[PDB]
Amino acid sequence: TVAYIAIGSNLASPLEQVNAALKALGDIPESHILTVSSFYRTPPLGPQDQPDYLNAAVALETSLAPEELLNHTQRIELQQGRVRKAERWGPRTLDLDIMLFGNEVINTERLTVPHYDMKNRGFMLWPLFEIAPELVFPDGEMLRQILHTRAFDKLNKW
Template sequence: MAQIPSQKRSKTRSEVRCYIGLGANLANPVQQLELAIAALHQVPLSRLVAVSSLYGSKPMGPQDQPDYVNAVAALDTTLLPEQLLDALQRIEQNQGRQRKAERWGPRTLDLDILLYGEQIINTERLTVPHYGLKQREFVLYPLAEIAAELQLPDGTVLSSLLEQVALNGLQKLHSSCS
């Protein structure tokens, strides 16, 4: 896990700690995540505070695609949830992401807002906590690496979820390049 040094700046709104899931399985996935982490440093009104190690995981859904590389980042931001979503989608597009109808298909980069503070959000564009957060080993284990004591908005303790979710071939690849 990499801890990022804090940066001083003026605050207009109070910062919210967000957790972002990163995943890629096309076009050199490790490099895609490294570029995404560099781009997260540039998100306006935000500060990258931690990044998990990179993990290798089997694909969800169709198995006729390459394995994924995943990580989780902690970001403090004053952006509103949908502003943060817009910023993440710009990063995806800049790295060649093309949104297709196929769910769980291969992709150059996938950035998901897993948690936005303690908020529960359910809009047409955004569901937070992320709907798959509690079941996905490739999210839970990297998240636990950077936020071991985390409690979800519904009161669930992260460590209790780890006891219920199998590794399913998840492997730590190496520390991130934050």
Template sequence: MIKQTELCYIGLGANLTEPVAQLQRAVAALAQLPACQLLHVSRFYSSKPMGPQDQPDYVNAVAALNTELSAQQLLQALQQIELEQGRQRKAERWGPRTLDLDILLFGQQQIDTPNLTVPHYGMTKREFVLYPLAEIAPNLVLPDGTALSQWLSAVPLNGLQPLQLAAQGTLCEGAPSDN
């Protein structure tokens, strides 16, 4: 029996405990997930925090992967990666984090459960999601039929800038070269 795969986009963010290293370890962990194939990773970007401004700037990226996992299984796997990297879930919304991994899109599915909303509820308003996503999937059309480029044109950079790091913006081995 052939398993169905879904093309998923994962938002990565960190602003505590060496955020660049946190994202690098998260990308390595994504590449090791069972029943998943990491396809693309955007460059890493520096962004201003969304919430309280008395916290360090964030480092953000977006990864694309194919998965045979269900959305709930993928969510559990991402939360396990967060825990392994020291994430502590606190009640403070938009507070500092060692690592945050969010399912942005799960194929063309629309999911609304108590613990998962896909497309991610805030992705169309967040420069630190849209610009890295556009880097790896410039022709993407969201499940509601809206082109990513439409959302991108409505969201300013707000200080977002790519970090100058070696070995960024990777097309992973075996990944299709066309989005």
């Protein structure tokens, strides 16, 4: 099972955050990073200040529970020393959630299976298109198929 996550960074050197954001997965239990996309500059959506903002997905080949996986990526924000204060919709500093995970559909308290938002955004479909566009939903749709209706080639690199 692959972990399609979306990393963000603004109020803390958008480049520095991503580094320890994708490599930290190497230590995560039952988690083993496989492929890595690149850095794409794009406008965020939330509080913070909406600066340059850097986004980059990553195909984390992990077998860790679908519910605890995202839970792990969350504690990574703490290890990165994020600056919590007003994070409701925008990255603000660092927020890596599960945008796509295998095919299972589970929703706990913190874990969130393919959140109905990435399919209508660009920094979640475009980046994922690199990590693993061969992902398909239980019904019958791939992130590639989603990009067929979306067509989000934006997210101009840093």
